Design an enzyme around this catalytic site. Structure first.
Site, PDB file in Angstrom:
ATOM      1  N   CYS B  93      22.698  35.659 -34.051  1.00 51.97           N
ATOM      2  CA  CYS B  93      21.798  34.833 -34.817  1.00 51.97           C
ATOM      3  C   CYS B  93      20.649  35.616 -35.446  1.00 51.97           C
ATOM      4  CB  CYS B  93      21.282  33.653 -33.993  1.00 51.97           C
ATOM      5  SG  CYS B  93      21.105  32.186 -35.016  1.00 51.97           S
ATOM      6  N   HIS B 347      20.963  26.598 -41.736  1.00 53.87           N
ATOM      7  CA  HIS B 347      20.991  27.806 -40.923  1.00 53.87           C
ATOM      8  C   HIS B 347      22.258  28.613 -41.254  1.00 53.87           C
ATOM      9  CE1 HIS B 347      20.551  30.650 -37.769  1.00 53.87           C
ATOM     10  NE2 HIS B 347      21.173  30.001 -36.796  1.00 53.87           N
ATOM     11  N   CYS B 377      16.168  32.559 -31.546  1.00 55.03           N
ATOM     12  CA  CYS B 377      17.128  32.636 -30.446  1.00 55.03           C
ATOM     13  C   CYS B 377      18.439  33.156 -31.014  1.00 55.03           C
ATOM     14  CB  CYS B 377      17.381  31.244 -29.826  1.00 55.03           C
ATOM     15  SG  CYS B 377      18.022  30.005 -30.979  1.00 55.03           S
TER      16      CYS B 377
HETATM   17  C1  LIG Z   1      21.783  30.021 -31.875  1.00 53.26           C
HETATM   18  C2  LIG Z   1      21.785  29.546 -33.299  1.00 53.26           C
HETATM   19  O1  LIG Z   1      21.079  30.147 -34.090  1.00 53.26           O
HETATM   20  S1  LIG Z   1      22.690  28.195 -33.779  1.00 53.26           S
HETATM   21  C3  LIG Z   1      24.085  29.035 -34.476  1.00 53.26           C
HETATM   22  C4  LIG Z   1      24.883  28.165 -35.437  1.00 53.26           C
HETATM   23  N1  LIG Z   1      24.789  26.746 -35.146  1.00 53.26           N
HETATM   24  C5  LIG Z   1      25.766  26.075 -34.526  1.00 53.26           C
HETATM   25  O2  LIG Z   1      26.086  26.278 -33.364  1.00 53.26           O
HETATM   26  C6  LIG Z   1      26.454  24.992 -35.323  1.00 53.26           C
HETATM   27  C7  LIG Z   1      25.397  24.053 -35.893  1.00 53.26           C
HETATM   28  N2  LIG Z   1      25.782  22.658 -35.837  1.00 53.26           N
HETATM   29  C8  LIG Z   1      27.042  22.231 -35.883  1.00 53.26           C
HETATM   30  O3  LIG Z   1      27.985  22.859 -35.436  1.00 53.26           O
HETATM   31  C9  LIG Z   1      27.272  20.916 -36.569  1.00 53.26           C
HETATM   32  O4  LIG Z   1      26.372  20.845 -37.680  1.00 53.26           O
HETATM   33  C10 LIG Z   1      26.937  19.754 -35.636  1.00 53.26           C
HETATM   34  C11 LIG Z   1      27.958  19.615 -34.511  1.00 53.26           C
HETATM   35  C12 LIG Z   1      25.551  19.964 -35.039  1.00 53.26           C
HETATM   36  C13 LIG Z   1      26.944  18.485 -36.475  1.00 53.26           C
HETATM   37  O5  LIG Z   1      27.856  18.669 -37.555  1.00 53.26           O
HETATM   38  P1  LIG Z   1      28.366  17.404 -38.416  1.00 53.26           P
HETATM   39  O6  LIG Z   1      28.424  16.201 -37.503  1.00 53.26           O
HETATM   40  O7  LIG Z   1      29.597  17.814 -39.195  1.00 53.26           O
HETATM   41  O8  LIG Z   1      27.151  17.178 -39.451  1.00 53.26           O
HETATM   42  P2  LIG Z   1      26.855  15.727 -40.082  1.00 53.26           P
HETATM   43  O9  LIG Z   1      25.669  15.861 -41.006  1.00 53.26           O
HETATM   44  O10 LIG Z   1      28.151  15.158 -40.600  1.00 53.26           O
HETATM   45  O11 LIG Z   1      26.397  14.873 -38.797  1.00 53.26           O
HETATM   46  C14 LIG Z   1      27.285  13.976 -38.134  1.00 53.26           C
HETATM   47  C15 LIG Z   1      26.860  12.551 -38.461  1.00 53.26           C
HETATM   48  O12 LIG Z   1      25.459  12.393 -38.199  1.00 53.26           O
HETATM   49  C16 LIG Z   1      24.809  11.821 -39.338  1.00 53.26           C
HETATM   50  N3  LIG Z   1      23.453  12.389 -39.532  1.00 53.26           N
HETATM   51  C17 LIG Z   1      23.073  13.670 -39.349  1.00 53.26           C
HETATM   52  N4  LIG Z   1      21.753  13.841 -39.627  1.00 53.26           N
HETATM   53  C18 LIG Z   1      21.271  12.644 -40.025  1.00 53.26           C
HETATM   54  C19 LIG Z   1      19.955  12.090 -40.416  1.00 53.26           C
HETATM   55  N5  LIG Z   1      18.871  12.896 -40.542  1.00 53.26           N
HETATM   56  N6  LIG Z   1      19.885  10.779 -40.748  1.00 53.26           N
HETATM   57  C20 LIG Z   1      20.965   9.978 -40.702  1.00 53.26           C
HETATM   58  N7  LIG Z   1      22.180  10.398 -40.309  1.00 53.26           N
HETATM   59  C21 LIG Z   1      22.398  11.697 -39.978  1.00 53.26           C
HETATM   60  C22 LIG Z   1      25.701  12.089 -40.543  1.00 53.26           C
HETATM   61  O13 LIG Z   1      25.669  10.993 -41.468  1.00 53.26           O
HETATM   62  C23 LIG Z   1      27.087  12.265 -39.942  1.00 53.26           C
HETATM   63  O14 LIG Z   1      27.850  11.066 -40.078  1.00 53.26           O
HETATM   64  P3  LIG Z   1      29.223  10.878 -39.252  1.00 53.26           P
HETATM   65  O15 LIG Z   1      28.955  11.577 -37.939  1.00 53.26           O
HETATM   66  O16 LIG Z   1      29.381   9.381 -39.136  1.00 53.26           O
HETATM   67  O17 LIG Z   1      30.267  11.546 -40.118  1.00 53.26           O
END
Ligand SMILES: CC(=O)SCCNC(=O)CCNC(=O)[C@H](O)C(C)(C)COP(=O)(O)OP(=O)(O)OC[C@H]1O[C@@H](n2cnc3c(N)ncnc32)[C@H](O)[C@@H]1OP(=O)(O)O
Ligand SMILES: CC(C)(COP(=O)(O)OP(=O)(O)OC[C@H]1O[C@@H](n2cnc3c(N)ncnc32)[C@H](O)[C@@H]1OP(=O)(O)O)[C@@H](O)C(=O)NCCC(=O)NCCS
Lengths: 392, 391
Positions: B93, B347, B377
């Protein structure tokens, strides 16, 4: 500046052949063992401990599977070493292991750390070249790409043709690589620099037999004759390079312990070498691997030196023509070049080799009581790394 | 020898997964931002891309488009001079931030007078985990016996350590979107962003031939506390959801560094220097709580306390990571992530470290303040920290 980086210890595994002596190790166990070994080499009489190391930077080319996910960190944790130590893995292809040293010295110069480890790993038995992309390798470059960058086998031929290097010329060179490596082993020149590594024995099907060896000898040496080299078929049609005049695919790791000088002095560790000049330069894409010509010229300029000043050269033998091209430009005394043999005879675990060469150069300076070495490598992507080190 | 200073810094806008930037090859996206950061210094001065001696770029998933030393390939792909050396680095990261540390080291050592630190991640095109095959067990030795959880389980373990509730993270997540929206409304990011030409794709992810100049971060959206409350946790029994975790993203950033006296001789104004840098190992059991250690380390090295720092950028991988760090170090939270963070802005992993340095510097300049702290992190249980000081 706020640090003065010196080498206090340097060590390498023996280099195993593809599916050979080290092939039963996980890439992370192989690197971890050598990281641990270079710390242990400081001795009880140093009072240095693994957790006095602030950062580790290791080179690795094919960062896929076992070698993915920052292998330098994973190895350090796998070897049971202390968790608070930071670690980063680097890729400038072939020169990675050398640039790992350059980067550690820079962090010491900057006063960011006092103690570092530069290392390199490649377990090519486990993770082979090209594992880090899918099968259609056209996809890895953009559609707009239009640089004549040849594959490395065609690169070596283009270089030979540009320099008028012949089949004979490269065979003579490959022969003397095997001869000098065999001299070095006979005389025990590598006995200081090697850390023997415990590995499981695998049979011809790559299956464990139950036994483990402490492996202490480079595997790549073999009985070689001119006639023998003459019979080998070239890798390319109409090419002059064969298996006997190209580096061997190999497994190995090497590590170099660096400190700020006043911290070395506190531990009573003799500062053994420092960097006079370092570089990583781009080369001509058409030739690809003729970059040692440029990195050499760049370090000589920075050091205010000429090729005559240098006592020992280590120039990686990726292909015979790369070294012979370099030598026709820079005109060294060849008795000073790769004196204990090179990658043709010894092997080329790609990400390891740049640390391995620094290790090998230093120990040969020490053995002959000489002052200056030059280390220089060609590298995929048309790059090249160069160091001049001086014994203290 | 050298006294490293930042002379220019710039970032692409951050696209969402399969969004505005997803039609660029990873090498084009990085190459565009390499070129941009050169052009920003070239216009005002005698500097040319061939004056750069080395480029160091962070990238996490070094597979496919991102394999084979993407820093080099991007530099050639953008048509920049071939004699410039390049290296790509992975400390997961923190890669983008370490790329800055390392470029600064090479200048201090007198190895180079000019270099570029950068970072890239094209997560639409090369997804996390692409750098290993299907069976992840294979990538560690059979001997491995360290309790190092996945990042989602980590965020929860950290929440538990610190008494951080579903409510607390949702409050954070909201503020992150509100802050990013304020920054966009006020034009805070206008100076730091290089707009990037990007191919438009159709429903089935195929180019139309259209290209658009992209200047806006894509991850912003209208967020409410009620809305965050209805989101499903990523893990069963977990507190984090999509709205309290960073967004998967595409983006690149780049920072041009020089020896200070050389920068001035070129006619360029030095903008910041590093007061203290670190990359430290963290507790493996929590995985992502390292910003507590990296922050302590750079402060100790700099002889500073947290109250000396004017602006903090701490990466919002998960809300709990930031809340945990803030519960240990007790900052004024009005100074922390003042323009939003990865929850709202996304990110692109290997880019982010350079992107936060860029964001931090520009917010020091916008407020005429002196010091910033950047802390992340990182997978493998590591953490990067920097204190920079405006010149
Ligand atoms: C150590 C580090 O630096 S982190 C390294 C890299 N990061 C990671 O590990 C991965 C980061 N995150 C992920 O893997 C993914 O983004 C997750 C699992 C957190 C979520 O991914 P997704 O669910 O595909 O994103 P998405 O925006 O579709 O969110 C899921 C749902 O929540 C909803 N949602 C998310 N944010 C909001 C918000 N602010 N308001 C309203 N609804 C929201 C979306 O509408 C979406 O709808 P659905 O689930 O009915 O399809
Ligand atoms: C060159 C290369 C293709 C050869 O691969 P290979 O065919 O697997 O080589 P092998 O070990 O199988 O040897 C092939 C044959 O050559 C013969 N041979 C090789 N070296 C010999 C020597 N020193 N003496 C006698 N015979 C030799 C052997 O007989 C062998 O066949 P045999 O074992 O049945 O007798 C391989 O080493 C490679 O791809 N190297 C990488 C190139 C490189 O330099 N990369 C650049 C990085 S900067």
């Amino acid at each position: 500046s706020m640090g003065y980086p010196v080498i206090v210890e340097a060590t390498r595994s023996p280099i195993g052949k593809r599916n050979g002596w080290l092939s039963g190790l996980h890439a992370t166990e192989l690197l971890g063992a050598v990281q641990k070994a270079v710390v242990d080499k400081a001795g009880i009489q140093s009072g240095l401990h693994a957790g006095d190391v602030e950062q580790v930077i290791g080179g690795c080319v094919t960062q896929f599977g076992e070698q993915s996910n920052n292998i330098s960190r994973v190895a350090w944790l796998t070897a049971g070493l202390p968790e608070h130590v930071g670690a980063t893995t680097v890729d400038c292809q072939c020169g990675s292991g050398q640039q790992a040293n350059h980067l550690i010295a820079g962090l010491i110069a900057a006063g960011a750390i006092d103690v570092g480890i530069a290392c390199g790993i490649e377990a090519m038995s486990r993770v082979g070249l090209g594992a880090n992309a899918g099968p259609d390798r056209s996809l890895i470059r953009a559609q707009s790409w239009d640089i004549d960058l040849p594959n490395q086998f065609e690169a070596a031929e283009r270089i030979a043709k540009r320099r008028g290097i012949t089949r004979e010329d490269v065979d003579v060179f490959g022969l003397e690589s095997q001869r000098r490596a065999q001299r070095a082993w006979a005389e025990g020149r590598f006995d200081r620099e090697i850390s023997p590594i415990q590995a499981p024995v695998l049979d011809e099907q790559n299956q464990p037999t139950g036994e483990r060896r402490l492996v202490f000898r480079d595997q790549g040496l073999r009985e070689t004759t001119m006639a023998g080299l003459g019979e080998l078929k070239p890798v390319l049609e109409g090419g002059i390079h064969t298996a006997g005049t190209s580096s061997q695919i190999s497994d190995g790791a090497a590590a170099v312990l660096w400190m700020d000088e006043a911290v070395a002095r506190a531990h009573g560790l003799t500062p053994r070498a420092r960097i006079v000049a370092q570089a990583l330069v781009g080369a001509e894409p058409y030739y690809h691997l003729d970059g040692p010509v440029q990195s050499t010229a760049k370090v000589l300029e920075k050091a205010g030196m000429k090729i005559g000043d240098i006592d020992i050269v280590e120039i990686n033998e990726a292909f015979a023509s790369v070294v012979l091209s370099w030598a026709r430009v820079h005109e060294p005394d060849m008795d000073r070049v790769n004196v204990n043999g090179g990658a043709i005879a010894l092997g080329h675990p790609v990400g390891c080799t740049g640390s391995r060469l620094i290790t090998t150069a230093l120990h040969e300076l020490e053995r002959t009581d000489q002052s200056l070495a030059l280390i220089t490598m060609c590298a995929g992507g048309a790059l090249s790394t160069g160091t001049i080190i001086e014994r203290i």
